[PDB]
Amino acid sequence: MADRLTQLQDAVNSLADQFCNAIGVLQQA
Amino acid sequence: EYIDQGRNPQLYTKECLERALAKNEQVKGKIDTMKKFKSLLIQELSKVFPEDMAKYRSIR
């Protein structure tokens, strides 16, 4: 494959995971 | 309700003082969390895009 879509989806998933972790840590070793 | 309870408002005053202390502690914790989040965002910006870091450091 080696297309831009793969890296785009990877970056989107990473950003979503970072946002979820920030939301979880903001309302909480 | 406190008058019909049969006691004075001194217990309510102590409860309000404890609530104020707890609110101050929670505000301090929230400020510390916001500062940590801002530091993490600044670090991510410096490691990703130096334009935003330079803007926040000199332009703001």
Binding site: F19, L26, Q27 | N8, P9, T13, A20, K23
Partner: protein, 48 residues
Amino acid sequence: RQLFVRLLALVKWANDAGKVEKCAMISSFLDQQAILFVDTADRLASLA
């Protein structure tokens, strides 16, 4: 006994009448701040 209790309550309310209002205002401000913080946190969580 009931009249003595009522007089004690009235004295405790009159000796700290302005202080009671100040404490009520402080408690209301703290509750409003906490509610606003909780609402902002919930909105941020729902948006993120």
